[PDB]
Amino acid sequence: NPEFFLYDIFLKFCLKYIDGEICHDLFLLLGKYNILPYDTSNDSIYACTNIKHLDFINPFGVAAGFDKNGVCIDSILKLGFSFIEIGTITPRGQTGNAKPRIFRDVESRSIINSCGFNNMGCDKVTENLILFRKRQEEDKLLSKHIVGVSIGKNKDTVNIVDDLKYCINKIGRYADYIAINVSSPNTGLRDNQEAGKLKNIILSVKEEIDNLEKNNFLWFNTTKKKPLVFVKLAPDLNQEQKKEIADVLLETNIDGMIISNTTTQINDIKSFENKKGGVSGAKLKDISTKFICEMYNYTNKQIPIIASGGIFSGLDALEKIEAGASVCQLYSCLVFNGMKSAVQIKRELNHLLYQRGYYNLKEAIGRK
Ligand SMILES: Cc1cc2nc3c(=O)[nH]c(=O)nc-3n(C[C@H](O)[C@H](O)[C@H](O)COP(=O)(O)O)c2cc1C
Ligand SMILES: CCOC(=O)c1nn(C)c(Cc2ccc(C(F)(F)F)nc2)c1C
Ligand SMILES: CCCCCCCCCCCC[N+](C)(C)[O-]
Ligand SMILES: O=c1cc(C(O)O)[nH]c(=O)[nH]1
């Protein structure tokens, strides 16, 4: 498709002259007017994957934080992705921290951000998602595409369980899966990663979803089933904390763990020396991949893993898969590679699996 080529003409210009968050706003604006390219290709049946009975037509989606409000789901999915995680959303809208709060380092292909859960609130985002689902009833390019919702707490909230229960009762019907975000470094959130607190949070979320069904058509999503429950983990933990959390995740029978969110322990990027927030991009890959391996070993391979962190090429994706991941999420790749992220990474992964001696992608999950 020549449209990806035409777009890459402006990528370096964007990185050099346009503020990052403004670049992101431009991205969403172009997609709102249905001007982004379309991935016209066909996905390899040998590259599909799944988490429980949630089936992904390909192993690549957009991570949370990119379309925080679901204003652009169709166009982002039609770039070539199989799923998108909208959010993180909160019961009421928040403006976030003061701008600029996103900083890029092109040399290291890394980003640091302190957004602060800026979003339009659960009500407006629920409206946007209902409209998308109506369009999806007709759009054949969007058939079988998955939409997940990441939910969080408002800054000035003490009871996280309240905020998450409001969101579930509002938008749960419309989501294929729900991602619990207790790993953002820019809001008392990583405190909720304490084993006991986390176990209560998870079991509460999973009860509010089950309660949606007890009160009797219902599931207005892609799967026609109740949404699965994922947990997004921060990588800034010691082995003891990782073992305890893995026990909690197994005890609550969550459906998947997203490894991982941004990290605050990177300090070989001189450009970010004076900045605060979580770091993402190529500098997070090795940290993120190792974290997958640990949790893959700690949970006895019983919890599917959604990989997130420094995935730019099919080789990185295969690293994640061969570490224990079943599906991959992109974010920084879209920042530094433009619209072609999905098409290019699908092409490369397909070639890799065909050459490395794999009948299909699911055969590569695990394999150390
Ligand atoms: C500007 C920005 C905003 C983000 N917002 C969220 C968010 O709201 N919720 C969330 O779970 N992760 C959020 N993330 C983390 C990403 O979803 C992803 O986990 C992380 O960037 C690592 O992936 P990557 O290396 O491909 O960028 C955000 C990341 C960035 C850079
Ligand atoms: C949250 C962090 O987002 C960013 O900082 C960011 N930076 N760039 C260059 C991009 C990709 C991009 C955006 C817009 C355009 C276009 F306007 F040319 F179309 N091309 C590429 C993003 C996203
Ligand atoms: C439309 C028949 C099913 C009724 C209940 C769910 C409706 C939600 C429609 C979302 C789009 C789903 N799909 C499979 C058509 O792409
Ligand atoms: O989960 C999150 C949230 C934010 C933010 O909104 O600031 N940033 C991240 O890096 N991860």
Quick one: three-class SS letters along 218-254? CCCCCCCCCCEEEEEECCCCCHHHHHHHHHHHHHHCC
Residue of 348, 336, 362 lying closest to 16 (CA atoms) = 336
How far, in Å, from the CA of 115 to the mean position of ligand 4?
6
Contact assessment for residue 228 and residue 256, using Cβ atoms and an 8 Å cutoff: yes
DSSP 131: H
DSSP structure string for 6-30: HHHTTHHHHHHHS-HHHHHHHHHHH
The helix/strand/coil state of 147 is strand
Overall fold of domain 1-368? TIM Barrel (3.20.20)
Q: Where are the beta strands (DSSP E) in 109-164?
A: 110-113, 119-121, 146-151
Distant-in-sequence, close-in-space partners of 275: CB < 8 Å, separation ≥ 6: 103, 112, 114
Calculate helix-pair angle for 195-214, 239-252, nearest 10 degrees.
20
Contact assessment for residue 39 and residue 60, using Cβ atoms and an 8 Å cutoff: no
What burial class does residue 127 get, using C-beta atoms within 10 Å of its C-beta: 0-12 exposed, 13-18 middle, 19+ buried? Answer: middle
Cβ of 152 closer than 6 Å to ligand 1, yes or no, is no
User: Can the peptide bond before residue 184 be classed as cis, meaning omega within 30 degrees of 0?
Assistant: no
DSSP 363: G
Binding residues for FMN: 64-68, 88, 181, 232, 280-281, 308-310, 331-332
Residue of 273, 278, 306, 310 lying closest to 292 (CA atoms) = 306
Cα separation, 202 vs 135, whole angstroms = 32
Contact assessment for residue 160 and residue 153, using Cβ atoms and an 8 Å cutoff: yes
Q: Where are the beta strands (DSSP E) in 99-162?
A: 102-105, 110-113, 119-121, 146-151
110, 183, 184, 326: which one is catalytic?
Answer: 184
Q: How many CB atoms lie within 10 A of CB 114?
A: 20
Cα separation, 81 vs 330, whole angstroms = 9
Contact assessment for residue 335 and residue 62, using Cβ atoms and an 8 Å cutoff: no
User: The tokens of 67 are what?
Assistant: 């379309």
DSSP structure string for 168-203: HHHHGGG-SEEEEE---S----GGGGSHHHHHHHHH
Contact assessment for residue 324 and residue 302, using Cβ atoms and an 8 Å cutoff: no
Report how far Cα 288 is from the mean position of its chain's Cα atoms. 14
Distant-in-sequence, close-in-space partners of 101: CB < 8 Å, separation ≥ 6: 21, 113, 114, 115, 116, 277
Cα separation, 87 vs 66, whole angstroms = 8
Q: Which residue has the tokens 């969101």?
A: 167
Ligand 1 pocket, mutate which of 103, 190, 261 (most atoms under 8 A from CB): 261
Cα separation, 230 vs 211, whole angstroms = 18
Cβ of 281 closer than 6 Å to ligand 2, yes or no, is no
Cα separation, 175 vs 222, whole angstroms = 8
User: Could you tell me if residue 301 is left (phi over 0), alpha (psi between -120 and 50 degrees) or otherwise beta?
Assistant: left
How far, in Å, from the CA of 185 to the mean position of ligand 4?
6
Cα separation, 285 vs 73, whole angstroms = 26
DSSP structure string for 28-91: HHHHHTT-S----S---TTT-EEETTEEESSSEEEPTTSSTT-SSHHHHHTTT-SEEEEEEE-S
DSSP structure string for 270-310: GGGTT--SEEEEHHHHHHHHHHHHHHHHHTTT-S-EEEESS
Q: Which amino acid, residue 277?
A: G
CA-to-CA separations, 315 to 44, 49, 297, in angstroms, rounded: 17, 17, 22
